[PDB]
Write a protein that binds this DNA or RNA. Structure first.
Lengths: 176, 226, 174, 232, 140, 382, 42
RNA sequence: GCGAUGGUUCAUUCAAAUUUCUGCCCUAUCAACUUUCGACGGCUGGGUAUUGGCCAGCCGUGGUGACAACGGGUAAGGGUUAGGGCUCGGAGAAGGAGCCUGAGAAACGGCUACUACAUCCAAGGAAGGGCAGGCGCGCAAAUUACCCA
RNA sequence: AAAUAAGCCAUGCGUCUAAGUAUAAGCAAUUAUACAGCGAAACUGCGAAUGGCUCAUUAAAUCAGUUAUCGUUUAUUUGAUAGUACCUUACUACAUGGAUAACCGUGGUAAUUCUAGAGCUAAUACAUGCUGAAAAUCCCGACUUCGGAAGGGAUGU
């Protein structure tokens, strides 16, 4: 929700840290709903790029906010140009190192999931649902965008993506 | 400088004659919208603090907020500004207005009491004035009376009784015709709109299917000629 | 005073003419927009038929087409390199049509390593002309502007590749 | 607000209707190829007397033009518009005569139900669909795929669909609606291309007068097949 | 100068030439089919469309950057003399480099959109004749 | 009104709030349709309609001090503000986006500007006395008052004669272009046009004095500042080879010392007789400095510095210590000061033209007295 | 040759009597010509 | 379910803008004219609703003319065919300069500044720029008519 | 039914339909009370590219015939017209907002809406606008009893 995101960002700025201090103007324009796509290419590929000294300070806040903007259904159009290009324009500009925290906020309960053990199939895991069938669809669309925007650089993140995609696939194959 | 003092929270207002400019010296060099204490004005104003909201100097010129000159200035006023109304659309007119600064040359000072004191001004703080009209749209009636989903605004609307002519007949009630009230006429209008949409899409479907079969028939007859 | 009529100029036979008529609103020509590099400053002009054209005066980003591979991405604009018409637009960095300007390369590089996977500028279908590879190792490509920035409100265009790329490199060397 | 003499010579006005003449409002048919409804009601038919009487006829739903109620007084009705009046129970049709003027034709519902309209152009509209534009500015979506330019169409006028079509043909009788040989019902016997603008046809009447009229000014009416009743 | 191009044809692919016929019973010359010049006011290379009037005539001055002037002669009827008189006019036309140019030849031109203050025509057919200089006369 | 620095405060009394403001159409839509709670007291403007909605180019206050002429970008125009009546006197449109104007008379009754489509436009309050095309492009504009003659620099090399480079000068009593004062710029390609090439060939800044001797100082792109003398019509000096393109040129109050500056961001205070610099300062970042003028707090002397990295630093001359520094939050293209004291008017890239107030360099000017009381109220707020 | 590029020295008619020459020079003309000699060369 | 209002695109109508060949009255006490606001191109862009030297950068050498250009004089018809009749046919709103609306104006309807008249006032201030009529000697001659039927 | 002036002098001078917004403290009423009929004021939409006046003129540039727009804009007219859901808010959301005018009051000035301050209230005015639901809607169609369809791809302008 855009109002709750704005009030939450105001509280994050009430936390007064010098890593967030030079980026506040760039932060609030992402929640201003008319200047999101321009502010994305102001943030990345700009003269005011994120400095790698306090990159460790801004990136969790920024990625929770960009995640919320990628979720929100209100201002987006229909079709692909509505919100599919928005998810693609976030993930195409994100770094592969920040993408780990991006998928960390992406996968809530399926972050620490294990599909395969020393034995074959974990039927104890598979005979249980942690997510709604409504909610897995946006997860799979997001991971499709992540993989199609990453390419080879998935190699440091092999251990969880395949567990997620395999869990949703075999839950569907049980539900046929 | 006579003080046109308004209490907006009670909705009352009163003009007060003030002589002895030594009493009015603390109003000097204060911009519009500034908070001044009314304590050095009079003993009946103990605890009052008020904002200054405008005024008219000598020769009756208005005082627009945001002009740093103390004297009378000659602004160019656009459409949606104060101190000027357009005679026609698109008109920018040069008008003289008094600057924001309260000087000695004023005639009336518009004041607004924001915080009272323990004493009541007898004609100002004592009289209550209700609002002229009640709310018209249903959700503002809902937020006013804090209704739930069931309590059906149409009996919770405000009312007013008037006595008409005809040598003193019965009282008569008046009620403001709620705008955002979902009536079955409104719902049937919505249903007729989406029914027009589905009728148009099925007519496009049938005409497209019949064009498909007729076009296949015509190219079959053309290849039968060939 | 700026107009589009032909009543002030001499004829085909070499004769001037009086032909005095007042300037009319269909001979109307407005003042030029030297679109420069900055943050987005666009003013909307209403025109005949009530139709809006977007006079962009300061622009930052536009999308550029690496279309031999099948992508176009929104990238920023660094500074104009050369202009075929004027030198003052090169001096004061004015974005017009058919301007060769250098742009950023990061989304094109990202899409290359995302689709093919072989990294670039740091099997056989992923293949890059080595001049364009030098542009990627610089991290700043040589694009050309195909959209009118003044009469559309955006500075978009395609990237230079092959013969045009080599031609404008030789013209930069000129 | 044109004068009575500057009004065209084919919707007639006598020495009676004042020095001025009504102009037709903008609509389907052209300006100079037009009969307004007030000239049809009170200057041709004389079912009315005055402008206010014509307004009192028009404003109540008593005059229907091409099967729809036409309210405004100077509505253009140029060519072959069936005009249904229900209180009198008549349907008039507009054709021409041999001299070049408007002619009215009384008819009932069976010939009043359809309209013979000449195709102006065929194109591919939005949605990838072929559409058809007649001289009444009627656009028909999804037509029959042989109905090309200068073909005429029997429009249903209760749904508006295509029912039949007559092809442009050397040997099909036609009606002239323009030019110096205006209004001469005869048979198309020859057609010359003249590519580069303004091609012609050579046309003869029933009784051997050859003349050349332009393919814009022609209008196909039927081979023999008088699908509208030309007045006997 | 900028690199001349046919405006919408993708040359730099790693996986042609656009020439339209003018029509009107004309044939495209081989230089207009394959010859590697690029000109946008050419009716076979550029997007210029020929419509309307179709004229002929004899060239005065071939020596100009792709623009020839035609002296068109005609016989005007003066009623005071009740006689025919010679009247010469000068047209201008943009020249494609597809054809082989001569002086004094009889050239066919065609009407297009205004390409300059004078230039409203393009060459379409050249008839190579041994026509002479300004002393030569023929209504044509 | 804001205050940017800690020790010596400046005051952004009027100015754009955001580096990327929205479209004014969308701003008015959200204002008239949404609910907003603005700072009604401290946020204001001081002169009416002191903006252009695109950008701005130059600000000059007259020697009478009653008129502020300012040229800006969309529907390229110049506003004339009467500063006693705190409003627009008028605004007149032009043919293209203006480069640089000067007032000729003590009032606004005569103006001249060098203008982007190679013109010089002379303006009266009646209208516009007609324009003169300069033959080649121009960079700045200066005025010989004692022998009334406009002199503009030019970029590129001349057509015939010598291949030095040129400064176009026309008298106003005589009316014609006299002769281009010939300044060497360097070598250029023999194969080019007559407007030059993209790399070099530019004279940038022309500076003169109007109360002292008035040596016509020019400055060109190969690090060269030149000196010409009036009544000689010929060269006097060529000096100051630097690495950067010379963009600053301004005399002091005495009539001896020069303050020049280069396109990398290095300023040199020279003497007119000593080749070695009196002062050097390498500041800011690599964006080129634009404008430097000397300004006297009533006892001392100090100097401006304005650079397009949004840095305007007021330096000291007697010690060289950085007195104060302002970040205008946007690109700024021109600086001027009110000749009394205190107020720096800056033409920017943004929508609103912004002006700074130094209480510690001077007082509020004679037309906006209450600015000192507003600074006083902000001092109460802190 | 073309539009403005050659300095056509023509006396301009409305540009003829704009401004009067106002000599504002605080130095006394005898010290100034001695100054321009004693620059970096001398 | 029937309409009213509104909406994207394509029509159509009503227009408007350019644009092709021919046709003006006389005159050589008008033979050179254009390049003197570019004069003829072509390339590139800008601006226009669009083409276009219309405008800006680069270069090429032109363009018209004794078959009557150019300059000068000011005295500024077409269609409908017995006939006559009938029909159609630039600049300004006190003076320059700049701006605003709208599908359509460079409205002159408004604004701003300068210039020039002129009105009210409590002397601080504030609003405004036409035609028609009579006299035009002291002696003269057609209604200040009624209605949109 | 024909009926020079230059200068003086007075007088004369929008827009409402059943079909946008009515709590006029406006009129007129009763047999089921948000509104219902008439409806001034005001907000909203339309209108004024002319009716016609004056006077230095326009010498194939206008204008006429004759073309073209494959080089352009078009309110109004009339005709067709829009397949565009889901896509991590769910431990959710499901009668959408705020402004003002008219109005009510307190005034300033010599100076008419020249207007200031204070309190309201509507929209077809300006403005946002995931949702009942495990479906929707397009192209393919194997198998076929006309059966009507297993399941495959896909998501405007």
């Amino acid at each position: 929700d855009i109002e709750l995101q704005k009030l939450a960002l105001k509280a994050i700025l009430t936390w007064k840290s010098e890593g967030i201090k030079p980026y506040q103007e760039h932060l609030e324009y992402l929640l201003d709903e008319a200047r999101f796509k321009n502010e994305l290419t102001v943030l990345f590929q700009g003269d005011n790029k994120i400095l790698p000294e306090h990159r460790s300070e801004v990136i969790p806040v920024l990625l929770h906010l960009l995640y919320g903007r990628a979720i929100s259904r209100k201002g987006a159009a229909s079709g692909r140009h509505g919100l599919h290009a928005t998810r693609l324009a976030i993930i195409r500009q994100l770094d592969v190192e920040d993408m780990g925290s991006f998928l960390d906020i992406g996968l809530g309960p399926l972050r620490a999931i294990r599909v395969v053990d020393e034995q074959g199939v974990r039927e104890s895991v598979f005979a249980h649902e942690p997510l709604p069938p409504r909610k897995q669809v946006g997860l799979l669309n997001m991971l499709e965008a992540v993989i199609n925007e990453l390419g080879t650089s998935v190699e440091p993140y092999m251990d969880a993506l395949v567990n997620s995609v395999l869990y949703c696939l075999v839950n569907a194959c049980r539900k046929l | 400088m006579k003080l046109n003092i308004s209490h907006p929270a009670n909705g009352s207002q009163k003009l007060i004659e003030v002589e002895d400019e030594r009493k009015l010296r603390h109003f000097y060099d204060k911009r519009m919208g500034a908070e001044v204490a009314g304590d050095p004005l009079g003993p009946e104003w103990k605890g009052y603090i008020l904002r200054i909201t405008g005024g008219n100097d000598k020769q009756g010129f208005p005082m627009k907020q945001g002009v740093i000159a103390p004297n009378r200035v000659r602004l160019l006023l656009s459409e949606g500004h104060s101190c000027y109304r357009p005679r026609r659309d698109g008109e920018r007119k040069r008008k003289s207005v008094r600057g924001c600064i309260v000087g000695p040359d004023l005639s009336v000072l518009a004041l607004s009491i924001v915080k009272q004191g323990e004493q009541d001004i007898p004609g100002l703080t004592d009289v209550v004035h209700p609002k002229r009209l009640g709310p018209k749209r249903a959700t503002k009636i809902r937020r006013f009376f804090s209704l739930s989903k069931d309590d059906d605004v149409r009996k919770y609307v405000i009312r007013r009784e008037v006595q008409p002519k005809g040598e003193g007949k019965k009282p008569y009630t008046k009620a403001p015709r709620i705008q955002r009230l979902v009536t079955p006429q409104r719902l049937q209008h919505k249903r007729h709109r989406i029914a027009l949409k589905r009728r148009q899409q099925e007519k496009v479907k049938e005409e497209a299917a019949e064009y498909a079969q007729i076009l296949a028939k015509r190219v079959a007859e053309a290849k039968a000629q060939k | 005073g700026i107009s589009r009529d032909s009543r002030h100029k001499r004829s085909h036979t070499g004769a001037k003419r009086a032909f005095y008529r007042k300037k009319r609103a269909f001979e109307l020509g407005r003042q030029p927009a030297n679109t420069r590099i900055g943050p987005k400053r666009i003013h909307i002009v209403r025109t005949r038929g009530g139709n809006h054209k977007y006079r962009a005066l300061r622009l930052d980003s536009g999308n550029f087409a690496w279309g031999s591979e099948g992508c176009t991405r929104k990238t920023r604009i660094i500074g104009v390199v050369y202009h075929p018409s004027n030198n003052e637009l090169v001096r004061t960095n004015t974005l017009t049509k058919s301007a060769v300007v250098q742009i950023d390369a990061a989304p094109f590089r990202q899409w290359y390593e995302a689709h093919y996977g072989q990294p670039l500028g740091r099997a056989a279908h992923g293949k890059v002309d080595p001049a364009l590879e030098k542009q990627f190792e610089a991290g700043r490509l040589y694009a050309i502007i195909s959209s009118r920035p003044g009469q559309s409100g955006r500075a978009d265009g395609y990237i230079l590749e092959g013969e045009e790329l080599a031609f404008y490199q030789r013209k930069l060397h000129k | 607000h044109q004068k009575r003499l500057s009004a065209p010579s084919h919707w007639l006005l006598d020495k009676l209707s004042g020095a001025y003449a009504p102009r037709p409002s903008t609509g389907p048919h052209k300006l100079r190829d037009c009969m307004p409804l007030i000239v049809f009601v009170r200057n041709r038919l004389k079912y009315a007397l005055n402008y206010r009487e014509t307004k009192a006829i028009m404003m109540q739903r008593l005059v229907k033009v091409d099967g729809k109620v036409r309210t405004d007084i100077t509505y253009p009705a140029g060519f072959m518009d069936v005009i249904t009046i229900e209180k009198t129970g008549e349907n008039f049709r507009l054709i021409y005569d041999t001299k070049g003027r408007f002619t009215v034709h009384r008819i009932t519902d069976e010939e009043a139900k359809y309209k013979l309209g000449k195709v102006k152009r065929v194109q591919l509209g939005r949605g990838g669909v072929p559409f058809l534009v007649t001289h009444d500015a009627r656009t028909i979506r999804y037509p029959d795929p042989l109905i090309k330019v200068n073909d005429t169409v029997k429009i249903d006028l209760e749904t508006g669909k295509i029912t039949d079509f007559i092809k442009f043909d050397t040997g099909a009788l036609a009606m002239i609606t323009g030019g110096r040989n205006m209004g001469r019902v005869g048979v198309i016997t020859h057609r010359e291309r003249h590519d580069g603008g303004f091609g012609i046809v050579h046309l003869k009447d029933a009784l051997d007068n050859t003349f050349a009229t332009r393919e814009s000014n022609v209008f196909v009416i039927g081979s023999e097949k008088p699908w509208i009743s030309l007045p006997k | 100068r900028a690199f001349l191009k046919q405006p919408h044809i993708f040359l730099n692919s790693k996986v042609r030439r656009w020439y339209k016929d003018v029509g009107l019973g004309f044939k495209t010359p081989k230089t207009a089919i394959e010859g590697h010049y690029i000109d946008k006011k050419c009716p076979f290379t550029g997007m210029v469309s020929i419509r309307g009037r179709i004229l002929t005539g004899r060239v005065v001055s071939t020596k100009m950057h792709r623009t020839i002037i035609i002296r068109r002669e005609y016989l005007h009827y003066i009623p005071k003399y009740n006689r025919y008189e010679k009247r010469h006019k000068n047209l201008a036309a943009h020249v494609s480099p597809a054809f082989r140019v001569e002086e004094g030849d009889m050239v066919v031109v065609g009407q297009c959109r205004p390409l300059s203050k004078t230039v409203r025509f393009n060459v379409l057919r050249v008839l190579p004749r041994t026509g002479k200089s300004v002393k030569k006369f023929q209504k044509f | 009104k804001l205050t940017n620095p800690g020790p010596v405060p400046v005051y952004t009394v009027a100015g754009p709030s955001t580096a990327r403001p929205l479209p004014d159409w969308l701003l008015r839509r959200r204002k008239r349709s949404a609910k907003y709670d603005p700072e009604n007291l401290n946020n204001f403007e001081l002169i009416q309609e002191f903006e252009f909605e695109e950008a701005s180019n130059c600000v000059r206050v007259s020697e009478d001090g009653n008129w502020i002429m300012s040229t800006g970008t969309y529907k390229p125009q110049f506003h004339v503000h009467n500063t006693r009546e705190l409003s627009l006197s008028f605004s007149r449109h032009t043919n293209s986006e203006n480069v640089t104007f000067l007032l000729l008379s003590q009032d606004y009754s005569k103006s001249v500007h060098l203008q982007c489509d190679r013109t010089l436009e002379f303006h009266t309050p009646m209208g516009c006395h007609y324009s003169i095309r300069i033959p080649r492009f121009g960079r700045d504009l200066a005025y010989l008052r004692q022998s009334c003659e406009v002199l503009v620099p030019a970029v590129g090399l001349s057509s015939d004669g010598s291949g030095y480079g040129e400064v176009f000068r026309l008298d106003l009593e005589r009316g014609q272009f006299l002769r281009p004062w010939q300044v060497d710029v360097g070598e250029d390609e023999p194969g080019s046009g007559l407007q030059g090439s993209i790399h070099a060939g530019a004279v940038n800044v022309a500076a003169v004095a109007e109360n002292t001797h008035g040596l016509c100082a020019f400055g060109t792109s190969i690090g060269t500042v030149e000196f010409y003398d009036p009544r000689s019509k010929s060269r006097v000096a060529v000096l100051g080879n630097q690495d950067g393109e010379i963009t600053a040129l301004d005399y002091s109050r005495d009539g001896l010392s020069l303050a020049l500056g280069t396109s990398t961001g290095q300023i040199r205070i020279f003497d007119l007789r000593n080749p070695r610099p009196l002062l050097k300062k390498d500041q800011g970042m690599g964006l080129p400095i634009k404008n430097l003028i000397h300004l006297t707090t009533p006892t001392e002397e100090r100097k401006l510095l304005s650079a397009d990295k949004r840095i305007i630093k007021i330096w000291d001359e007697q010690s060289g210590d950085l007195w104060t520094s302002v970040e205008p939050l946007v690109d700024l293209n021109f600086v001027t000061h009110v000749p009394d004291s205190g107020m720096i008017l800056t033409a920017n890239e943004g929508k609103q033209m912004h002006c700074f107030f130094i209480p510690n360099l001077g007082l509020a000017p004679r037309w906006c007295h209450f600015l000192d009381n507003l600074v006083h109220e902000m001092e109460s707020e802190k | 040759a073309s539009k403005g590029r050659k300095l056509r020295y023509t006396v301009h008619e409305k540009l003829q009597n704009f401004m009067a020459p106002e000599d504002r020079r605080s130095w006394e003309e005898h010290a100034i010509d001695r100054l321009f000699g004693t620059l970096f060369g001398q």
